[PDB]
Coordinates of C-alpha atoms and ligand atoms in Angstrom, one line a residue:
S1 CA -21.3 -8.3 5.7
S2 CA -23.0 -7.0 2.6
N3 CA -19.5 -6.0 1.4
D4 CA -16.6 -8.0 0.1
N5 CA -14.0 -8.5 2.8
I6 CA -10.4 -9.7 2.2
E7 CA -8.5 -10.6 5.4
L8 CA -5.0 -9.0 5.7
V9 CA -2.0 -10.6 7.4
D10 CA 0.9 -8.7 9.0
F11 CA 4.5 -9.7 8.2
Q12 CA 6.7 -8.5 11.1
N13 CA 5.3 -4.9 11.0
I14 CA 7.1 -4.6 7.6
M15 CA 4.3 -5.2 5.2
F16 CA 0.9 -6.9 5.0
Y17 CA -0.5 -9.3 2.5
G18 CA -3.9 -10.6 1.2
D19 CA -4.8 -13.6 -0.9
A20 CA -6.7 -13.7 -4.2
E21 CA -7.2 -16.2 -7.0
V22 CA -6.8 -16.2 -10.7
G23 CA -8.4 -18.6 -13.2
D24 CA -11.8 -20.3 -13.0
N25 CA -10.0 -23.1 -11.2
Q26 CA -9.2 -20.6 -8.4
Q27 CA -5.4 -20.7 -8.5
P28 CA -4.2 -19.2 -5.1
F29 CA -1.7 -16.4 -4.7
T30 CA -0.5 -14.1 -1.9
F31 CA -0.5 -10.4 -3.0
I32 CA 0.9 -7.1 -1.9
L33 CA -2.2 -4.9 -2.1
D34 CA -0.8 -1.6 -3.3
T35 CA -2.7 1.8 -3.6
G36 CA 0.5 3.1 -5.2
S37 CA 0.3 0.9 -8.3
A38 CA -2.3 0.2 -10.9
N39 CA -1.8 -3.2 -12.4
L40 CA -2.2 -6.8 -11.3
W41 CA 1.1 -8.7 -11.7
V42 CA 1.0 -12.5 -11.5
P43 CA 4.0 -14.9 -12.0
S44 CA 3.6 -17.4 -14.8
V45 CA 4.3 -21.1 -14.8
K46 CA 6.4 -20.0 -17.9
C47 CA 8.7 -18.1 -15.6
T48 CA 11.9 -20.0 -14.9
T49 CA 14.0 -17.5 -12.9
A50 CA 15.2 -18.7 -9.5
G51 CA 12.7 -16.3 -7.9
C52 CA 9.7 -17.9 -9.6
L53 CA 10.7 -21.4 -8.6
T54 CA 9.8 -20.5 -5.0
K55 CA 6.4 -19.0 -5.8
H56 CA 2.8 -20.0 -6.5
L57 CA 2.6 -19.8 -10.3
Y58 CA -0.3 -19.2 -12.7
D59 CA -1.1 -21.8 -15.4
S60 CA -3.5 -20.3 -18.0
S61 CA -4.0 -23.8 -19.5
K62 CA -5.9 -24.9 -16.4
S63 CA -8.5 -22.1 -16.6
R64 CA -11.6 -22.4 -18.8
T65 CA -12.0 -18.6 -18.8
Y66 CA -8.5 -17.6 -19.9
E67 CA -8.6 -15.2 -22.9
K68 CA -5.3 -14.7 -24.7
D69 CA -4.1 -11.1 -25.1
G70 CA -0.3 -11.3 -25.4
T71 CA 0.6 -7.6 -25.6
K72 CA 4.2 -7.4 -24.4
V73 CA 5.1 -5.7 -21.1
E74 CA 8.6 -4.5 -20.3
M75 CA 9.1 -2.2 -17.3
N76 CA 12.4 -1.1 -15.7
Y77 CA 12.8 -1.6 -11.9
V78 CA 15.9 -1.6 -9.6
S79 CA 17.8 -4.7 -10.6
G80 CA 16.8 -4.4 -14.3
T81 CA 13.7 -5.2 -16.4
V82 CA 10.6 -7.1 -15.4
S83 CA 8.9 -8.5 -18.5
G84 CA 5.8 -10.4 -19.4
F85 CA 2.6 -10.0 -21.3
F86 CA -1.1 -9.2 -20.8
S87 CA -3.6 -12.0 -20.2
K88 CA -7.3 -12.0 -19.3
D89 CA -8.8 -14.4 -16.8
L90 CA -11.2 -14.6 -13.9
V91 CA -9.8 -12.8 -10.8
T92 CA -11.5 -13.6 -7.5
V93 CA -11.1 -11.2 -4.6
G94 CA -12.9 -12.3 -1.5
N95 CA -16.4 -13.5 -2.6
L96 CA -16.4 -11.5 -5.9
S97 CA -15.0 -12.5 -9.2
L98 CA -14.7 -10.8 -12.6
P99 CA -12.7 -11.3 -15.9
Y100 CA -9.8 -9.0 -15.6
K101 CA -6.7 -7.9 -17.6
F102 CA -3.5 -8.6 -15.8
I103 CA 0.3 -8.9 -16.4
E104 CA 1.5 -12.5 -16.7
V105 CA 5.2 -12.2 -15.6
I106 CA 7.8 -14.3 -17.4
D107 CA 11.0 -12.6 -16.1
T108 CA 11.2 -11.3 -12.5
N109 CA 15.0 -10.7 -12.4
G110 CA 14.6 -6.9 -12.2
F111 CA 12.8 -7.4 -8.8
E112 CA 15.5 -9.1 -6.9
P113 CA 16.5 -9.6 -4.2
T114 CA 13.1 -8.2 -3.1
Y115 CA 11.1 -10.9 -4.9
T116 CA 13.1 -14.0 -3.8
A117 CA 13.4 -12.8 -0.2
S118 CA 9.6 -12.1 0.2
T119 CA 6.7 -14.5 0.9
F120 CA 4.3 -12.9 -1.6
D121 CA 3.7 -14.1 -5.2
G122 CA 2.2 -11.0 -6.9
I123 CA 1.2 -7.3 -6.7
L124 CA -2.4 -6.2 -7.0
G125 CA -2.6 -2.5 -7.7
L126 CA -5.4 -0.3 -6.4
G127 CA -4.5 3.0 -7.9
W128 CA -6.1 5.0 -10.8
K129 CA -6.4 4.1 -14.6
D130 CA -3.9 6.7 -15.6
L131 CA -1.2 5.2 -13.3
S132 CA -1.6 1.8 -15.1
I133 CA 0.3 0.2 -17.9
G134 CA -2.1 -0.3 -20.8
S135 CA -5.0 1.9 -19.5
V136 CA -6.7 -0.8 -17.4
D137 CA -9.8 0.2 -15.4
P138 CA -9.2 -0.5 -11.7
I139 CA -10.8 -3.8 -10.3
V140 CA -13.1 -1.9 -8.0
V141 CA -14.3 0.4 -10.9
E142 CA -15.0 -2.6 -13.0
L143 CA -16.9 -4.4 -10.2
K144 CA -19.2 -1.3 -9.8
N145 CA -19.8 -1.1 -13.5
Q146 CA -21.1 -4.7 -13.4
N147 CA -23.4 -4.0 -10.4
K148 CA -21.5 -6.4 -8.3
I149 CA -21.0 -3.6 -5.7
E150 CA -23.1 -0.4 -5.1
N151 CA -20.3 2.1 -4.6
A152 CA -16.9 2.1 -6.4
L153 CA -14.8 2.4 -3.2
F154 CA -12.6 0.3 -1.0
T155 CA -11.3 0.6 2.6
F156 CA -8.2 -0.4 4.5
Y157 CA -8.2 -1.5 8.1
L158 CA -4.6 -2.5 8.5
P159 CA -3.5 -5.4 10.7
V160 CA -1.4 -4.5 13.8
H161 CA 1.5 -6.7 14.8
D162 CA 0.6 -8.6 18.0
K163 CA -2.8 -6.8 18.3
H164 CA -5.4 -7.6 15.6
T165 CA -6.2 -8.7 12.1
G166 CA -6.8 -6.4 9.1
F167 CA -9.3 -6.2 6.2
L168 CA -9.5 -4.8 2.7
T169 CA -13.2 -4.1 2.2
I170 CA -14.7 -3.5 -1.2
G171 CA -18.0 -1.7 -1.8
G172 CA -18.9 0.0 1.4
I173 CA -17.8 1.6 4.6
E174 CA -18.3 -0.6 7.8
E175 CA -18.7 0.9 11.3
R176 CA -16.7 -1.9 12.9
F177 CA -13.4 -0.4 11.6
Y178 CA -13.5 3.2 12.8
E179 CA -14.4 5.7 15.5
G180 CA -15.1 9.4 15.5
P181 CA -15.7 11.4 12.3
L182 CA -14.8 10.3 8.8
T183 CA -13.4 13.3 7.0
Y184 CA -12.8 13.4 3.2
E185 CA -10.0 15.0 1.2
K186 CA -10.3 15.7 -2.5
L187 CA -7.7 14.1 -4.8
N188 CA -5.3 16.6 -6.4
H189 CA -4.7 14.1 -9.3
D190 CA -6.5 11.0 -10.5
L191 CA -3.2 9.0 -10.4
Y192 CA -2.0 8.0 -7.0
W193 CA -4.3 8.6 -4.1
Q194 CA -2.8 12.0 -3.6
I195 CA -4.2 14.8 -1.5
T196 CA -3.1 18.2 -0.4
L197 CA -2.4 18.7 3.3
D198 CA -0.4 21.2 5.4
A199 CA 2.4 19.4 7.2
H200 CA 3.8 20.5 10.6
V201 CA 6.4 18.8 12.7
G202 CA 7.6 21.0 15.6
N203 CA 8.5 24.4 14.1
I204 CA 9.1 23.0 10.6
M205 CA 6.2 23.4 8.2
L206 CA 5.2 22.8 4.6
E207 CA 1.9 24.3 3.3
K208 CA -0.2 22.4 0.8
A209 CA 2.2 19.4 0.6
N210 CA 1.3 16.6 -1.8
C211 CA 0.6 13.5 0.4
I212 CA 0.3 10.1 -1.2
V213 CA -1.7 7.5 0.8
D214 CA 0.2 4.3 -0.1
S215 CA -0.5 0.9 1.3
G216 CA 2.5 -0.7 -0.3
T217 CA 5.0 1.6 1.4
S218 CA 6.3 0.3 4.7
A219 CA 7.5 3.7 6.1
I220 CA 6.4 7.4 6.2
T221 CA 8.5 9.3 3.7
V222 CA 9.4 13.0 4.1
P223 CA 11.3 15.5 1.9
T224 CA 15.0 15.1 2.7
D225 CA 15.5 18.8 3.8
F226 CA 12.3 18.7 5.9
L227 CA 13.6 15.5 7.6
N228 CA 17.1 16.7 8.3
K229 CA 15.7 19.8 9.9
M230 CA 13.0 18.1 12.0
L231 CA 15.5 15.7 13.6
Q232 CA 18.1 18.3 14.6
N233 CA 19.1 18.0 18.2
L234 CA 16.6 15.2 19.1
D235 CA 19.1 12.5 20.2
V236 CA 18.4 10.6 17.0
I237 CA 21.5 9.1 15.3
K238 CA 23.0 6.9 12.6
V239 CA 25.2 4.0 13.8
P240 CA 28.2 3.0 11.7
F241 CA 26.3 0.0 10.3
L242 CA 23.0 -1.0 11.9
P243 CA 19.4 0.3 11.5
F244 CA 19.3 3.8 9.9
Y245 CA 17.8 6.4 12.3
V246 CA 17.8 5.0 15.9
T247 CA 16.7 6.5 19.2
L248 CA 15.8 5.4 22.7
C249 CA 12.2 4.2 22.8
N250 CA 11.5 6.5 25.7
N251 CA 12.9 9.6 24.0
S252 CA 10.7 12.6 25.0
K253 CA 12.1 14.9 22.3
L254 CA 10.5 12.8 19.5
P255 CA 8.0 14.9 17.5
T256 CA 4.4 14.4 16.4
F257 CA 3.6 14.8 12.7
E258 CA 0.6 17.1 12.1
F259 CA -1.2 17.2 8.8
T260 CA -4.1 19.6 8.4
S261 CA -6.8 20.6 5.9
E262 CA -9.9 22.8 6.1
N263 CA -11.7 19.5 6.7
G264 CA -9.5 17.7 9.3
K265 CA -6.4 17.2 11.5
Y266 CA -4.4 14.0 11.4
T267 CA -1.5 13.3 13.8
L268 CA 1.2 10.7 14.0
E269 CA 2.8 10.3 17.4
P270 CA 6.1 8.5 18.0
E271 CA 4.4 5.3 19.1
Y272 CA 3.2 4.8 15.5
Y273 CA 6.5 5.4 13.7
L274 CA 8.9 3.7 16.1
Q275 CA 10.1 0.1 15.6
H276 CA 11.6 -1.7 18.6
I277 CA 15.0 -3.3 17.9
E278 CA 15.5 -4.8 21.4
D279 CA 17.7 -7.6 20.1
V280 CA 20.4 -5.0 19.3
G281 CA 20.1 -3.0 22.5
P282 CA 17.8 -2.5 25.5
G283 CA 15.3 0.2 24.9
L284 CA 16.5 0.9 21.4
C285 CA 14.1 1.9 18.5
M286 CA 14.4 2.6 14.8
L287 CA 12.4 5.5 13.2
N288 CA 10.3 4.1 10.4
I289 CA 10.8 7.3 8.3
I290 CA 12.8 7.9 5.2
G291 CA 13.9 11.0 3.3
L292 CA 12.7 11.0 -0.3
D293 CA 12.6 13.9 -2.8
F294 CA 10.0 14.3 -5.4
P295 CA 9.9 17.0 -8.2
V296 CA 7.4 18.7 -5.9
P297 CA 7.4 18.5 -2.0
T298 CA 5.6 15.2 -1.1
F299 CA 5.0 13.0 1.8
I300 CA 4.2 9.3 1.4
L301 CA 1.7 8.3 4.2
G302 CA 2.5 4.6 4.2
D303 CA 1.7 1.8 6.5
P304 CA 2.6 3.6 9.8
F305 CA -0.1 6.2 9.0
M306 CA -2.6 3.7 7.7
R307 CA -2.2 1.6 10.9
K308 CA -3.5 4.5 13.0
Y309 CA -6.1 5.7 10.5
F310 CA -8.8 3.7 8.8
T311 CA -8.9 4.9 5.1
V312 CA -11.6 5.1 2.4
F313 CA -10.6 5.3 -1.2
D314 CA -13.5 6.6 -3.3
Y315 CA -13.4 6.4 -7.1
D316 CA -16.9 7.9 -7.6
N317 CA -16.2 11.0 -5.5
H318 CA -12.4 11.3 -6.3
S319 CA -11.5 11.5 -2.6
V320 CA -9.8 9.7 0.3
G321 CA -11.7 9.5 3.6
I322 CA -9.8 9.2 6.9
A323 CA -10.9 8.2 10.4
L324 CA -9.3 6.8 13.6
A325 CA -9.1 3.0 13.2
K326 CA -10.7 1.1 16.1
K327 CA -7.9 -0.2 18.3
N328 CA -9.3 -3.8 18.5
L329 CA -11.6 -5.9 16.4
Ligands
LIG401 C1 5.7 -11.1 -9.9 C2 5.5 -9.7 -9.3 C3 6.0 -8.7 -10.3 C4 6.1 -7.3 -9.5 C5 6.6 -6.3 -10.5 C6 6.6 -4.9 -9.9 C7 7.7 -4.5 -9.2 C8 7.7 -3.2 -8.6 C9 6.6 -2.4 -8.7 C10 6.6 -1.1 -8.1 O1 7.2 -0.2 -8.7 N1 6.0 -0.8 -6.9 C11 5.2 -1.6 -6.0 C12 5.9 -2.3 -4.9 C13 5.1 -2.7 -3.8 C14 5.6 -3.4 -2.7 C15 7.0 -3.6 -2.6 C16 7.5 -4.3 -1.4 C17 7.1 -3.9 -0.1 C18 7.6 -4.6 1.0 C19 8.3 -5.8 0.8 C20 8.7 -6.7 2.0 O2 7.8 -7.1 2.7 N2 10.0 -6.9 2.3 C21 10.3 -7.7 3.4 C22 11.0 -9.0 2.9 C23 12.2 -8.7 2.0 C24 11.7 -7.8 0.8 C25 11.1 -6.5 1.5 C26 8.6 -6.3 -0.5 C27 8.2 -5.5 -1.6 C28 7.9 -3.2 -3.7 C29 7.3 -2.6 -4.8 C30 6.2 0.6 -6.5 C31 6.6 0.7 -5.0 C32 6.8 2.2 -4.7 N3 5.5 2.8 -4.8 C33 5.4 4.1 -4.1 C34 5.6 5.4 -4.9 C35 4.6 6.3 -5.0 C36 4.9 7.5 -5.7 C37 6.1 7.6 -6.4 C38 7.1 6.6 -6.3 N4 6.8 5.5 -5.5 C39 5.0 2.8 -6.2 C40 4.8 1.4 -6.6 N5 5.5 -2.9 -9.3 C41 5.4 -4.1 -9.9

């Protein structure tokens, strides 16, 4: 391709990962590629937590292009603080490289057990500058500024468990990934990749909902009240202690999400949001949906949505494009 393509690998229909390198010696790492964050986080050889001892670690002393920064970073997560400091070095994504400012992580203890229990080393954000710590221009913006690509956009063709591989593509939109019309939705903020869509599920509706397209979220998230309502009398239950909302895989009462704009209509049928849990019971499924409240009514269109729809993230035009993903590649 004329474009930069990074192959994506599915992990049990839970999350996907991509590889990238840091340092002019091309130190390898596995990353979460997250449109819902806006920094690049890389664990240091200087990190001595139990979590880091299992990871690929970054050694700045081995890179000729390392440029010291040192500005301290402290961020609060779930299990406490994650801390480190800014560094600059060559970051290689696919066949493109550039010197880039990233967070060199010294203490990961605030990211446990998630961090220890996962097979990735780092997080590479793909959101907007205003979402970032330290006002860092996004990688794709920086690549365009340097004439390494002709459009400041990237696309996601997500891998599908037991079906096909996935690609993150930087710089252009490739026909091999989609079918039918590509429709564009304007961003309502340059922060997350957030757009305004009318949401309908059965009789329940939310006009002009804030919908965040988020590659690092493994579920669809729905306002709690909206969820509670839409599942009433559907033969969907919670078991004393197993997998959250469960249902028979062949349940005909299961609804289709419908999101609309003046530009387009996007639907998510049960086949896209159901996860088989056959090992716990014949014909049993879990609904890959969670209830989550934001200060304003908001849906997170995470991986289940992005598996059905090819997505285009356009910094130049401040928009997200959406098209049906080709079923095979
Ligand atoms: C050395 C690495 C240092 C990482 C430091 C770090 C930690 C957390 C986040 C973060 O907030 N993230 C990034 C993050 C990405 C992926 C994950 C993640 C996803 C899946 C998995 C996973 O595969 N498994 C399966 C194995 C066990 C662990 C879970 C692990 C981690 C966690 C956190 C959030 C997630 C929620 N996002 C959505 C959102 C949008 C709008 C409002 C609120 N929230 C915002 C960004 N950033 C950086």
